[PDB]
Amino acid sequence: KKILIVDDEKPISDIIKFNMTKEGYEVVTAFNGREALEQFEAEQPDIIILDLMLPEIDGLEVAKTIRKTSSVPILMLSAKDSEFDKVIGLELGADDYVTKPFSNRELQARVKALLRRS
């Protein structure tokens, strides 16, 4: 199963990359909205973990732009855990919203849950 980890933070990207790889997932990474859309179009991941510096403005435009063409599960990973952020992320098309810091086992279960419904 392929996960595109759209993260502008390489350390977090490596953590998710390592755990998902240890679990058997192939990982592709993007570090900006341009790459995110580039990697999304180029790699077509089974699930996208969206974590950009601007979750709603950039990630939202990435999600908005991705949602214009794909229903690919988007697990909005964001440090922002407000209901507005949660609701807006979900209202904009995010299928799930996990807050950073996340549990590798839970993220693994949620990716699995997300993937389980796809």
Curated annotation (Swiss-Prot):
Key words of the record: Cytoplasm, DNA-binding, Phosphoprotein, Transcription, Transcription regulation, Two-component regulatory system
Gene: walR
Record's comment on post-translational modification: Phosphorylated by WalK; can also be dephosphorylated by WalK.
The protein's name: Transcriptional regulatory protein WalR
Domain of life: Bacteria
GO cellular component: cytosol; membrane; protein-DNA complex
Protein's cellular compartments: Cytoplasm
Quaternary structure, from the entry: Monomer. Homodimer.
UniProt key word Aminoacyl-tRNA synthetase: no
Record's keyword annotation contains Nucleus: no
Modified residues (4-aspartylphosphate): D51
Miscellaneous notes: Part of a walR-walK-walJ operon.
GO biological process, one term: fatty acid biosynthetic process
One Gene Ontology term of the molecular function aspect: cis-regulatory region sequence-specific DNA binding
Function: Member of the two-component regulatory system WalK/WalR that regulates genes involved in cell wall metabolism. Binds to the promoter region of the transcription factor fabT gene in the fabTH-acp operon in vitro. Inhibits transcription of fabT, probably acting in an unphosphorylated form, thereby playing a role in the regulation of fatty acid biosynthesis. Essential for normal growth in vitro. Required for maintaining normal cellular morphology, acting, at least in part, by regulating peptidoglycan hydrolase pcsB.
Ranges for domain Response regulatory: 2-115
